[PDB]
Design a protein around this ligand. Structure first.
Ligand SMILES: Cc1cc2nc3c(=O)[nH]c(=O)nc-3n(C[C@H](O)[C@H](O)[C@H](O)COP(=O)(O)O)c2cc1C
Length: 370
């Protein structure tokens, strides 16, 4: 199998197996995508699949400033321009529907409220916020409040609404953000979940929320338009799990029964070493994939983290993964697909302009000529 040949992710047809990883850019004031955002995504429409920047299902699900959401009518309209543009350019695009859980700040929350989480354990993490009087970071994340059962029901409804909004905005589907220490992972992992009810303790209980979210979203828009991002060992956002194999194998055994479009896996620490581990034992990614496949899982297996041209080509050729998502290389290379096809040089990413600001370091990375 070639990295450059078409693929299928549930109901979504992909032109090739090069995926644009979700990348928060903080360039949508008021949680509403704008014209510059449309330019940015259109530039990258040769990707087999674009996964958007995390896009929250609600204001409660926001953790950073100037992030586009799916909860305002104006935001849905803004996204529609983006998906239309991507489609006209021959692309496909899914919304990474997001809830940050404890990773937020009161100034971003409705009513100036506490971020919500499975347990009231403050993260030692930071959020991108815009100084009331200029301008940009940093505050420690706020103390979170433990979710009640009723609160959880309200969030599930927000996931239904968000998935519905994604379809209204013309997305081809959604990727449920269940990675990088955010709300769903906060329930999954032991360091963040000290609940004594049906959502805490056992692996089955800790995965309960993830599976309810998946089932709610899949019921709303169709399993064949539903994917999910997972990150078994990442230390992102102050999270820790000492025994991820049984937990994550169980998760994908369950996902394997649900006819999903794709599973997107962050292999290692997000943006860090691929061989990262937290517990005593290394994570076995082959065993993890096997647990999905052996349960009947037929979703496209999209892998991420530290890939380059050669490792991506090799991983797809061997069948270890079905497709590869690139993060930082897509920031810097709108025509990454053509560059990789021709084995051309790449532009280097400029980290200082990843978050916030303007067109510089966003829409001005050049494509190659002709
Ligand atoms: C600027 C930036 C923003 C990111 N925002 C998100 C995000 O919104 N959602 C997500 O799941 N991962 C996010 N990540 C992680 C990337 O999707 C990806 O996992 C990471 O960059 C590693 O892949 P790479 O080695 O190809 O860059 C972000 C990464 C970067 C560099």
């Amino acid at each position: 199998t070639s990295l450059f040949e078409p693929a299928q992710a549930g109901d979504i047809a992909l032109a090739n197996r090069i995926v644009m990883a979700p990348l928060t850019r903080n360039r949508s004031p008021g949680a509403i995508p704008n014209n510059l955002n449309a330019t940015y995504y259109e530039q990258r429409a040769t990707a087999g699949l674009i996964v958007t920047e995390g896009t929250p299902i609600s204001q409660q699900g926001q953790g950073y400033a100037d992030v586009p959401g799916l909860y305002k009518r104006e935001a849905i309209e803004g996204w529609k321009k983006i998906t239309d543009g991507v489609h006209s350019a021959g692309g496909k695009i899914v919304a990474q529907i997001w809830h940050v859980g404890r990773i937020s700040h009161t100034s971003l929350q409705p009513h100036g409220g506490q971020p919500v989480a499975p347990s009231a354990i403050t993260a030692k993490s930071k959020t991108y916020i815009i100084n009331d009087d200029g301008t940009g970071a940093f505050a420690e994340t706020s103390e979170p409040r433990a979710l009640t059962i009723d609160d959880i029901g309200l969030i599930l409804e927000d996931y239904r609404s968000g998935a519905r909004a994604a379809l209204e905005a013309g997305f081809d589907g959604v990727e449920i953000h269940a990675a990088n220490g955010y709300l769903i992972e906060q329930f999954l992992k032991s360091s963040t979940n000290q609940r004594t009810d049906d959502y805490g303790g056992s692996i089955e209980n800790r995965a309960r929320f993830l599976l309810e979210v998946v089932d709610a979203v899949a019921e709303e828009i169709g399993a064949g338009r539903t994917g999910i991002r997972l990150s078994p060992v990442t230390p992102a956002n102050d999270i820790f799990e000492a025994d991820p194999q049984p937990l994550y194998n169980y998760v994908v055994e369950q996902l394997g029964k649900r006819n999903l479009a794709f599973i997107h896996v962050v292999e290692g620490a997000t943006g860090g070493p691929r061989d990262f581990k937290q517990g005593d034992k290394p994570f076995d990614y082959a065993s993890f994939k096997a647990a999905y496949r052996n349960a009947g899982g037929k979703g496209l297996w999209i892998a991420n983290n530290g890939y380059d041209r050669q490792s991506a080509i090799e991983a797809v050729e061997s069948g270890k993964v079905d497709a590869v998502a690139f993060g930082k290389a897509f920031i810097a290379n709108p025509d990454l697909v053509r560059r990789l096809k021709n084995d051309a040089p790449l532009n280097a990413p400029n980290q200082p302009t990843f978050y916030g600001g303007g067109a510089e370091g966003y829409t001005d990375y050049p494509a190659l000529a002709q």
